[PDB]
């Protein structure tokens, strides 16, 4: 019996690993602000809270929502960026997220990093085009 969509959300310790690695990576980027690096902290806090609400043996119907949940909360950090710094901030997220994925246990699959990246950008790019900064 095989055929279950188990990417990386298959172990609390594992999933929380990549989440922390993301924060630690971006905190040492030199790109983010003092606010943004702390904003990611409360973001990660939110992740492990809802990750425990995922359930034993994470069902894929939760996983298909969780990637969007993360993305939406990561988008907050990026939405705090001006158009000048946006690209550098996004670059950090897009890179560290991939790194953190494999540094957890489940390697870095393109699909998950794709969903996250796509959604983060889409949920972050709102009217950040014309501005005094």
Automatic annotation (TrEMBL):
Residues covered by the Spidroin N-terminal domain: 8-129
Disulfide bond residue pairs: 25-96
Superkingdom of origin organism: Eukaryota
Protein name: Minor ampullate spidroin
Residues of the full protein shown: 23 to 151 of 1766
